[PDB]
Design a protein around this ligand. Sequence first.
Ligand SMILES: Nc1ncnc2c1ncn2[C@@H]1O[C@H](COP(=O)(O)OP(=O)(O)NP(=O)(O)O)[C@@H](O)[C@H]1O
Ligand SMILES: Nc1ncnc2c1ncn2[C@@H]1O[C@H](COP(=O)(O)OP(=O)(O)NP(=O)(O)O)[C@@H](O)[C@H]1O
Ligand SMILES: Nc1ncnc2c1ncn2[C@@H]1O[C@H](COP(=O)(O)OP(=O)(O)O)[C@@H](O)[C@H]1O
Ligand SMILES: [Mg+2]
Ligand SMILES: [Zn+2]
Ligand SMILES: [Zn+2]
Ligand SMILES: [Zn+2]
Lengths: 379, 382, 382
Amino acid sequence: PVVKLVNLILTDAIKRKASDIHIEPYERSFRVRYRIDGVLYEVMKPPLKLKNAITSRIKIMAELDIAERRLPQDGRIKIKDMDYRVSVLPTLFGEKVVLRLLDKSQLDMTKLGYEPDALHYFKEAIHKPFGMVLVTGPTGSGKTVSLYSALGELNKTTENISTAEDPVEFNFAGINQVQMHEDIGLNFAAALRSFLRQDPDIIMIGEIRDFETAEIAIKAALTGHLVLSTLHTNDAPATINRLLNMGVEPFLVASAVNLITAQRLARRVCSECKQPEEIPIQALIDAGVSPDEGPSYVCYKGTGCVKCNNTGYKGRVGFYQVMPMLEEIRELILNGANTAEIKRESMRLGIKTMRQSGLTKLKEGVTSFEEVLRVTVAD
Amino acid sequence: DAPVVKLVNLILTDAIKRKASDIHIEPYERSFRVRYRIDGVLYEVMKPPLKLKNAITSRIKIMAELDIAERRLPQDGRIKIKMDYRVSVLPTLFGEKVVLRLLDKSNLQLDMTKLGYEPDALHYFKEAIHKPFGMVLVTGPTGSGKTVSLYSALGELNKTTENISTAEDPVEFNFAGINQVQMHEDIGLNFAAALRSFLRQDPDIIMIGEIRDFETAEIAIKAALTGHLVLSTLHTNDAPATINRLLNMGVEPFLVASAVNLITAQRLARRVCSECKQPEEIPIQALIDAGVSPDEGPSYVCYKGTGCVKCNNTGYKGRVGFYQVMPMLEEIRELILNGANTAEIKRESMRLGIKTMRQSGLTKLKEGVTSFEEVLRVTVAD
Amino acid sequence: DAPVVKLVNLILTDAIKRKASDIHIEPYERSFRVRYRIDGVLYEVMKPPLKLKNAITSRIKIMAELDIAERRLPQDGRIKIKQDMDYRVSVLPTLFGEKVVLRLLDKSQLDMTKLGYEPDALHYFKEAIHKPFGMVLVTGPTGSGKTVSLYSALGELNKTTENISTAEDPVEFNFAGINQVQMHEDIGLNFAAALRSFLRQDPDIIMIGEIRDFETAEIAIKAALTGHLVLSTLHTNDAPATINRLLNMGVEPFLVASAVNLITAQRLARRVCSECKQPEEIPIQALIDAGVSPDEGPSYVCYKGTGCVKCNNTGYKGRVGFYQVMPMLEEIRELILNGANTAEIKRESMRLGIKTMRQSGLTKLKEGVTSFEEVLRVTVAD
Ligand SMILES: Nc1ncnc2c1ncn2[C@@H]1O[C@H](COP(=O)(O)OP(=O)(O)NP(=O)(O)O)[C@@H](O)[C@H]1O
Ligand SMILES: Nc1ncnc2c1ncn2[C@@H]1O[C@H](COP(=O)(O)OP(=O)(O)NP(=O)(O)O)[C@@H](O)[C@H]1O
Ligand SMILES: Nc1ncnc2c1ncn2[C@@H]1O[C@H](COP(=O)(O)OP(=O)(O)O)[C@@H](O)[C@H]1O
Ligand SMILES: [Mg+2]
Ligand SMILES: [Zn+2]
Ligand SMILES: [Zn+2]
Ligand SMILES: [Zn+2]
């Protein structure tokens, strides 16, 4: 009965073109709201007796902790396919649940916004016969799209590609995709060991979270396989310190990793209402613009039009830090250099930081100065 | 049983008739007293028998559904009497001290036009909260009416088309349609954790109780840049100094100029009792020193209450707000981006007609609603 | 009636007569002695026969309700003697017997004028604690007078119009009107939990016994900026070093610059006995090396006590405080935000006239309150 009601809330939202579902308890009421074309509408008022059953069911569908009701929790629901991003939030009179429709509908690497130098290092690293490629960033930074874009360039009938994902974001023909199931025993570590017995060529791990997974992944890269994975780290230099703090010996990181990227997703200025805004040149220089390049900058910002919902932005751009494991960086790891020394050395060799990549796209007029300062830290 | 039940109920009802905000039930080694906070000042209203020390505090526990067996640890609950009270139990060395916070929605005034804003200031505040995105900061110390200003703004925005989420420490009043979160930092639910959760909750309007550090300030500023309306508070000396506070926290100057729509500063002064109101012979030179023009000085008629039954013999009844409403004008924005300090931002705001809190206090002094000592206590000279 | 019973009573009462703070009963291989700590310095007061060491120790443990059967482990307890004197008893198992330490706990000044503050330092301290918000930090090593200074500040602020709440470990003196909470960590009542409960108790003034970790420091400094007056202590060695200690713990710089009203550093130095005192011929050059200006050098008259029965033949009777009272002046705030080190902060405070502890000691030397040897013993050179 309650399962039927929850399924109706989900199936009614896809029929009514809703992008978000809001299940909200209050002291004297309990309502469900759909966001349709940016506007919330009350679409249902279930009785107050059912609010515990409806919330628990959704938390079970999202594999969340039903015993904990005081802390925020975030999960995911897949229905057939429609995928929901679940967010639980402890209010005064119960838990509020928000489900956000994920619109899956460009896997092409040449259209992701990599600068030519960055795209060169990235393509060079994934076409090596073995080694590790790490794509880092926070949630919603485009990591998975970058990984799948790399798998597209590599997917040939001549190579065996196997992935361990939690969950499988997209179904790829020719790619052997395994979905994780921890309660049964199918985690990243178990899949990696089986992959080594599967005559593999390219291995993709959804994320390196623990030393047990890093150990097998590093070993697989040194054995002669190409290993791609992700981590949640601040930048590419800090990714090295993360692996070391997990217990991986420094010489194994120096020799196994081909390449580490760090990326953030910024908004692209609306091409219809963009126009220059007056920014003192000293502000640009304080943000990392060299004094010589300063005067040549034209910082664009959308004023807000109908083609962008009066936001001034339409679309997104990528700010990439593509750091190859250059020999200078390898020696620094072997000498136990800290994150600061590794970042400075990478900048000396021409590896642009995410801040510098953002200033480049600001120079090209495709993003605003506030976006650069919002998603990147200073160097 | 009944003598204590009657006494405890009398403690709760006399607080309502005196219009007190809080009740303090405090045991000591050789005494026992009850204090009401009336218009921000505590007063001794009762010295009950010390034999009833444990009986009185235990009765309120039962009303608050708290643990009578535990008397060594702090406890917190709520009471509804057929008027709501928030209860806080503190274990001192001579018994449990109980504090009760009166929460009457009926007494709360939420219409923005009845909060005491001057019409030009009210226009800029309303314009700021009805913009689709940006940040609005209401500054002042705790107990300066900031939450009422925020609740008034949220009530003006509480439509079924928007999702409003608040993070409060604690939640003073609850409103239908508004998703409110009470902070519980002992278990990890601080302002930052609730802010990052709000960003995954598909928000439209976000209210934060106070911005206390760089981490929360960064999430708040950047949420105001990504299409959300952000309402929050800080404790600063005035509206112009709120700019320097954010910069010192670590926020980039360009993001402050881009994200903030408006900053207000406010203080709560006590309102002179209308019945015992009498003219006070404040020397003209004292008024000129406070900021009154010398040509206006002799015309000023300062008032103060002599004390009567209607005002609990305090001379005051109610509160008035001294407001400074500073919109993020383009002139002020250009000052921020050129590294201007607090003094030159304050001069620029006064140049453009933005009244300071001292000027707002002196206006209320001229109208006879507040006293000369209240103006000097809560405001500084310009 | 028994010999040892009378002897133990003599040791306990003689300490009260001599104004001792601590009693040390120490057995060694070939000797046995009793030492009193008088004005912070230990003196041998008795040499009882070593044969009696087990009877004296056993007798004290009976009065302290300690276990006489156990002689290999440390034990702790209390003793109350009848007008009452309390003793905190600590037993320690040395190689040649059990050592016993007794700590006298006597309430028997409250007045700030009798503690040793110079008029300028007193003015800065009084205006800082009378502000409606901010943090006041009293720093110094153990036994430097921090609790007395805070109790003295609370006494000047103890009004019926304000709510004062303290978290102490332990509570050392009971004040009517002040809500004092004693820490009990084993049940979860620590400084952090008590401070969080105070914030739900409608506070005005909060006193935290000591800041011993970053978690408590952040809560306390943020509560002060929210709009409360907060008093606490740290174990640092001067006022400028307290600034960097807070920063090194992880407190954000804007919090230190904007939320701290004032920081004090202090040491206790012994006073020359008024009965004993005689002038001491200190070479004028030696005074100059200690930090006295050349103009003032020849005018100094330094005194030293020869020793009399009234001062226990030490030349010193009582103690006085050397205070460095540093208000958070605007010049100092700019240094916190610009990353200055302790030496820069110290040089700048001296430039603005903030007297160091050494200079305060030299002031007491000129006035004949303390001796030249005491200034060099308890203060470092600048
Ligand atoms: N280069 C890009 N430019 C613009 N948008 C992008 C880009 N790459 C990905 N996106 C968008 O990012 C969204 C999904 O981001 P995603 O790659 O899932 O983040 P993520 O890093 O995988 N988060 P998580 O899986 O929780 O670690 C998609 O809807 C894409 O439209
Ligand atoms: N200004 C003063 N002049 C003379 N004597 C003082 C002064 N201040 C305190 N004392 C005495 O010296 C002793 C100092 O103890 P107290 O003030 O508790 O030190 P404290 O800093 O609290 N030590 P601790 O709590 O262990 O860090 C007390 O017994 C006071 O009676
Ligand atoms: N403009 C006003 N006029 C009269 N009373 C007010 C006004 N603003 C606030 N108050 C009262 O003062 C009390 C304290 O205000 P509140 O906003 O809760 O404190 P803070 O400013 O610390 O958030 C409230 O309970 C409210 O009833
Ligand atoms: Mg102490
Ligand atoms: Zn547009
Ligand atoms: Zn009256
Ligand atoms: Zn003497």
